[PDB]
Design a protein around this ligand. Structure first.
Ligand SMILES: O=C(Nc1cccc2ccccc12)C(=O)N[C@@H]1O[C@H](CO)[C@@H](O)[C@H](O)[C@H]1O
Length: 813
């Protein structure tokens, strides 16, 4: 049908059709009479997977022959989503499979909807890992993703009576055709025990053993025949584990204790919980990965070349134990001296920070590390002592610097600051957007920056244009390809060429046509799968991201209530109709976040059923926001809400997805918004609110929310509506916690930005009244979104951190 989806040649369609039938028969043990749509999905998945295998085997054998420097991306999260369509796109198989399935009498799109998301992540951090793997494969890097194979990923969110309910995400229920178990590569991981000092070195003894079994998933590059590996560890009990009948039975049942390590993803976004099971997960992935890394290095004795052959990227502090674990292996097992081992460690490791919020920093109680990892604690103390000697030598007599920079935090409970550990043990520390990276140097890691300025870098985040344009928005990718060709898909800077089409009437019409098609398709999805009815001619105002106070879904809520109140005050006045969509999961134990969801649904309950409002204002809560839902809603959006308090959102990546897909952005000068506005031009962006400097000034003076309440009559009315029970007639005080928080304990200054926000929102409405000028501003956004490709991000990591050259050259098919 469309060009960017590849050729549907006669030879290929015939080959796919017969491989499909082969798999249906031999692999699924079915015939066309008993086959369900799920069987059809699986036959297609297996047929497409067969095209990866050759490339996968030859890529890995290529790395063995050429022996390049390997990149190990260590993360607790890989938010992959669905794999079928992405594999077809990267293999240029999409049209062929569409044709082949059409001829068999099937709709491929319907089959695609059957695949479960691999929801092995919470949000932005996990999705960055996923985009990164794609870019690393596309740029021909010998890269490996290492993580945990959670049996249960992020929970499925159900909305019941407006309240979030969590249910287990049993994503492996029907099996995973993309993964290959590698039980022959099973590795032991040790916990507990004690430290024994001998004539020659310390020894970690009397440990409990858990087995780590790897499962390899292929990561195909974009049409370069490169297929890299994501290796995920699963926890297994050894067969002598815990080993009377009742006693024998119990011993076997207790194997579950060991295997609980890889059972479930911790669903806590932007807050730190010092739970023992979480620490076990962190060590588990670190220990298994480092043994695998070293084994591979040895099968190429001299660890001086180790940093020339190995890069380890730490996705936040979650795999921070890699630092003392590498020290442990090099000192205790390989018998290298401390100083040499340390040189190797630092040159091997690099650390990426993803937030400045203090409650997010990992600070593990010493008593936990003592019990679980006694040797690692000793190594940490030793690292800390040697590090503080360097600080003392550099800043003599500066005693408070010493305690500020210590890896060990004194207090009621001693803790290890894992961020401090990462900086000390890494040759590079980066933030994820320019403003975030500067904030790291000027505030939370200022002392470390003063000691080692060369260590600190920026690597502005990015998103993969494969999943986030070609895959989710084929209509937009096609009209672009018509004008400038297909090369931009792996060279997103080329979109600048669209700037010469901003006055092109055919292109304007096409861009606007594609958006309306996406909106009609999404409006239909809402009706079909959720029985909710929206006006496709309204402005699609969307805020999709995890629910957190800093992201200020509450500020969005206030605006929504303002629009409603204004409508009710002047019913027969014209207003640009809006469909306001808010979606996102709340962490299970985060009361305020759960209250915000309830508020959003409660507003919808009032707004959507007011006859006076009509189809002019609709408030919808998008249930179960996840990667596959993002691929649907983002192409349909007109307005992207990126309204975090300045200084709180490290980068954001959702913002970039929207920019790439033809939505305009309303947002604060926060995270990557700043660089987006700079790329597109500030006049093509809806910027409002306090800047970072403004937030600082308000903090120095003290934020008094009462002041805004007293001076803004429209804001006062909304607060009184909330308190009086206007949005909860049967539970009048339901939102008392929200009001109290806003009025007395708002860390994120919702009221301070309210006026500028509402005003700016009026400017959005005004522009939307002029379809031609809206669309031209859209084109200016799409055309300048090239910087935000994760191909750019990864090439910067490769060149400035890892010391490797990306390559766009094909491997032979
Ligand atoms: O720090 C983040 N999450 C977490 C904070 C605290 C504890 C966590 C525990 C498990 C998983 C994520 C956690 C996070 O999601 N950071 C996000 O990283 C994205 C990718 O760099 C950025 O675009 C976002 O601005 C940032 O909030």
């Amino acid at each position: 049908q469309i060009s960017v989806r590849g050729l549907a040649g006669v030879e290929n369609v015939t080959e796919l059709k017969k491989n499909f039938n082969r798999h249906l028969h031999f692999t699924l043990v079915k015939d066309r009479n008993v086959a369900t749509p799920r069987d059809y999905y699986f036959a297609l998945a297996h047929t497409v997977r067969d095209h990866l295998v050759g490339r996968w085997i030859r890529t890995q054998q290529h790395y063995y022959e050429k022996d390049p420097k390997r990149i190990y991306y260590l993360s607790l999260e890989f938010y992959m989503g669905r794999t079928l369509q992405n594999t077809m796109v990267n293999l240029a198989l999409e049209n062929a499979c569409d044709e082949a399935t059409y001829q068999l009498g099937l709709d491929m799109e319907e089959l695609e909807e059957i695949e479960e998301d691999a929801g092995l992540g919470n949000g932005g951090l996990g999705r960055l890992a996923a985009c990164f793997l794609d870019s690393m494969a596309t740029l021909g890097l010998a890269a490996y993703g290492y993580g945990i194979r959670y049996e249960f990923g992020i929970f499925n969110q159900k909305i019941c009576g407006g309240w979030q309910m969590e249910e287990a995400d049993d994503w492996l229920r029907y099996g995973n055709p993309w993964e290959k178990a590698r039980p022959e590569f099973t590795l032991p991981v040790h916990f507990y025990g004690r430290v024994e000092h001998t004539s020659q070195g310390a020894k970690w003894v009397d440990t409990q053993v858990v087995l780590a079994m790897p499962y390899d998933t292929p990561v195909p590059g974009y049409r370069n025949n490169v297929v890299n590996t994501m290796r995920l560890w699963s926890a297994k009990a050894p067969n002598d584990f815990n080993l009377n009948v009742g006693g024998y039975i119990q011993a076997v049942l207790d194997r579950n204790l060991a295997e609980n390590i890889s059972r479930v993803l911790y669903p806590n976004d932007n807050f730190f919980e010092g739970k023992e099971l979480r620490l076990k997960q962190e060590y588990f992935v670190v220990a298994a990965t480092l043994q695998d890394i070293i084994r591979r290095f040895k099968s190429s004795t001299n660890f001086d070349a180790f940093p020339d052959k190995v890069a380890i990227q730490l996705n936040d502090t979650h795999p921070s134990l890699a630092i003392p674990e590498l020290m442990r292996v090099l000192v205790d097992l390989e018998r290298l001296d401390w100083d040499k081992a340390w040189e190797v460690t630092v040159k091997t490791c690099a650390y990426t920070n993803h937030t400045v919020l203090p409650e997010a920093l990992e600070r593990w109680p010493v008593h936990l590390l003592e019990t679980l990892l006694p040797r690692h604690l000793q190594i940490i103390y030793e690292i800390n002592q040697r590090f503080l000697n360097r600080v003392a030598a550099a800043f003599p007599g500066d005693v408070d610097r010493l305690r500020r920079m210590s890896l060990v935090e004194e207090g009621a409970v001693k803790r290890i600051n894992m961020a401090h550990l990462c900086i000390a043990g890494s040759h590079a520390v980066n933030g994820v957007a320019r403003i975030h990276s500067e904030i790291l140097k000027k505030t939370i890691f200022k002392d470390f920056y003063e000691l080692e300025p060369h260590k600190f870098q920026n690597k502005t985040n990015g998103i993969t244009p494969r999943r986030w344009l070609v895959l989710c928005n084929p209509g937009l990718a096609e009209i672009i390809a018509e004008r400038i060709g297909e090369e931009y898909i792996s060279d997103l800077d080329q979109l600048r060429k669209l700037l010469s089409y901003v006055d092109d009437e055919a292109f304007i019409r096409d861009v606007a046509k594609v958006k309306q098609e996406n909106k009609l398709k999404f409006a239909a999805y809402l009706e079909r799968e959720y029985k909710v009815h929206i006006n496709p001619n309204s402005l699609f105002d969307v805020q999709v991201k995890r629910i957190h106070e800093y992201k200020r879904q509450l500020l969005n809520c206030l605006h929504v209530i303002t629009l409603y109140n204004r409508i009710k005050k002047e019913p027969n006045k014209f207003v640009v109709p809006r469909t306001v969509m808010i979606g996102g999961k709340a962490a299970p134990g985060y009361h305020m976040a759960k209250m915000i969801i309830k508020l959003i649904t409660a507003i919808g309950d009032v707004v959507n059923h007011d006859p006076v409002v009509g189809d002019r204002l609709r408030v919808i809560f998008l249930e179960n926001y996840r990667v596959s839902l993002a691929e649907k809603v983002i192409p349909a959006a007109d307005l992207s809400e990126q309204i975090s308090t300045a200084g709180t959102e490290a980068s954001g990546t959702g913002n970039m997805k929207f920019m790439l897909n033809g939505a305009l952005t309303i947002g604060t000068m926060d995270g990557a918004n700043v660089e987006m506005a700079e790329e597109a031009g500030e006049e093509n962006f809806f910027i409002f609110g306090m800047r970072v400097e403004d937030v600082d000034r308000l903090d120095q003076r003290g934020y008094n929310a009462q002041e805004y309440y007293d001076r803004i009559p429209e804001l006062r009315q909304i607060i009184e509506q909330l308190s009086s029970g206007f949005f909860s007639p049967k539970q009048p005080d339901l939102f008392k916690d929200i009001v109290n928080m806003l009025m007395h304990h708002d860390r994120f200054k919702v009221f301070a930005d309210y006026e500028e926000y509402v005003k700016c929102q009026e400017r959005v409405s005004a522009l939307y009244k002029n379809p031609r000028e809206w669309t031209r501003m859209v084109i200016r956004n799409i055309a300048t979104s090239g910087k935000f490709s994760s191909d750019r991000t990864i090439a910067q990591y490769a060149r400035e951190i890892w010391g490797v050259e990306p390559s766009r050259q094909r491997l032979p098919a």
